[PDB]
């Protein structure tokens, strides 16, 4: 009850550090900014909407939207010989022909609320720098995937937990205050570092707590409470518009927690064992990378994002229960190949749905999210009972670091790849959905 509130809090925790991008790192609409335009929009009276059309560049043909968004016209606004009327309509017949400079003067943000984004200017040329965000975060979840098992082999097991969890807390709130964007990365990779180890630590002692009687059941509670973590998480957002205040109170929770007191080779020297681990670990790779890039996707084109987050993050709640009553009356490999085909055939479709049918693809994107959210519980138990208890923490380790591999690929597949095509994501995520329902057919039940 006791131990069992307060590791359901440490996953409820994790859940808006794993996530909090979508919230601290929102893009709103923004133009350049510029000298004269204020000005000039008071001495005629331009509405907002109507002073973007008199002083932003068009949107151009059938898309760029960048020459919007990425520059600006090369014109003198404090000049009063512009008209009142259209100042475009006096320099030149087609808007095409003005010259075109960069943002020097900053940028304007359609939003009262902040994000790092908005903050420290990642856009345009800098907007990779956000994705870099989530990148650090995964190769922290990376390298300390390695380093835990070292630290726990030469120190002691509940000092490392409370160092684990005091360090996570630390540097959580550090960053709320971090002064500039290197140093706000360094503290997401240290937490980055740390926050696994912390989630699989407390994942271990409430799974060595509960015998095998109730350990599939006290699973899938865990997991539901990373489900509830991201429930507060979105009130949290909703009720914080600033980014700061939020990384504060997702923060504050872990001080609750304070307050409260082999032989590698073998994974691959046989044959079938190296095919089994390598379907494994392309399962792992596969719902890690479709989790991660359907939840950024959605925060990166959702016009109602507080509502589609709501509504996909109690879609897991049914998915874990179907999961529950599944794996006991049905068995595992059939669900999770249906499961990750049910995911694969949703992304497909979200690229033919015209987006002004959202009402349409929030469905979808719920289909998808529950059958990724079944497949990820199908895999933990199909992962653990695969190999044997000598072997199986060794193969575990391994195979969710390919989940971290993928964390760092992903963000740039969400985020730069999609500047290529807008559906090009969903056709990958559609791929490797669908491959990885095929390979799992090839497992033993
Ligand atoms: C990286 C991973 C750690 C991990 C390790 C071993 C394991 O069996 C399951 C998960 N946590 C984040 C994410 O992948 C996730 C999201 C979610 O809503 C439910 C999850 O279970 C997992």
Aim: charged letters at 10%.
């Amino acid at each position: 009850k006791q131990a069992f509130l307060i590791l359901c809090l440490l996953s409820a925790a994790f859940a808006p550090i794993c996530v909090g991008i979508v919230f601290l790192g929102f893009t709103p609409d923004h133009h350049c900014q510029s000298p004269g335009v204020a000005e000039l929009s008071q001495r005629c009276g331009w509405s907002p909407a109507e002073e973007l059309n008199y002083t932003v560049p068009g949107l151009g043909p059938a898309g760029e939207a960048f020459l919007g968004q990425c520059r600006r016209y090369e014109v003198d606004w404090n000049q009063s010989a512009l008209s009142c009327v259209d100042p475009l309509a006096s320099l030149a017949t087609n808007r095409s022909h003005l010259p075109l400079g960069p943002c020097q003067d900053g940028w304007v943000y359609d939003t009262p609320g902040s994000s790092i984004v908005t903050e420290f200017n990642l856009v345009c040329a800098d907007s990779w720098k956000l994705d870099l965000f989530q990148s650090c975060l995964n190769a922290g979840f990376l390298f300390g995937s390695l380093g835990v098992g070292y630290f726990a082999d030469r120190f002691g097991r509940k000092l490392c937990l409370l160092g684990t969890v005091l360090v996570n807390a630390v540097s959580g709130v550090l960053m709320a205050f971090s002064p500039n964007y290197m140093s706000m990365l360094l503290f997401r990779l240290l937490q980055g570092l740390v926050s696994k180890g912390n989630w699989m630590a407390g994942y271990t002692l409430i799974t060595e707590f509960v015998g095998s009687g109730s350990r599939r059941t006290v699973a899938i509670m865990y997991q539901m409470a990373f489900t509830v973590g991201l429930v507060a998480l979105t009130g949290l957002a909703y009720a914080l518009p600033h980014w700061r205040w939020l990384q504060l109170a997702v923060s504050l929770p872990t001080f609750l927690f304070l307050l409260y007191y082999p032989s590698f080779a073998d994974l691959f020297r046989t044959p079938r064992l190296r095919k089994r681990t390598f379907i494994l670990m392309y399962l792992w790779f596969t719902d890690s990378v479709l989790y991660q890039g359907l939840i950024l996707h959605m925060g990166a084109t959702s016009g109602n994002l507080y509502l589609d987050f709501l509504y996909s993050a109690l879609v897991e709640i049914p998915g874990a229960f179907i999961a529950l009553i599944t794996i006991d009356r049905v068995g595992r490999i059939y669900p999770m190949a249906m499961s990750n085909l049910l995911a694969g055939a949703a992304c497909l479709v979200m690229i033919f749905i015209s987006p002004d049918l959202h009402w349409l693809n929030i469905i979808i994107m719920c289909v998808g999210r529950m059958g990724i959210t079944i497949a990820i519980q199908m895999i933990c138990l199909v992962n653990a009972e695969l190999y044997p208890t000598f072997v199986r923490n060794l193969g575990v380790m391994v195979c969710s670091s390919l989940c971290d591999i993928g964390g760092i690929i992903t963000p740039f597949i969400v985020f730069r790849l999609r500047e290529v095509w807008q559906a090009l994501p969903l056709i990958l995520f559609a791929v490797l959905g669908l491959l990885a329902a095929g390979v799992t057919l090839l497992l033993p039940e």
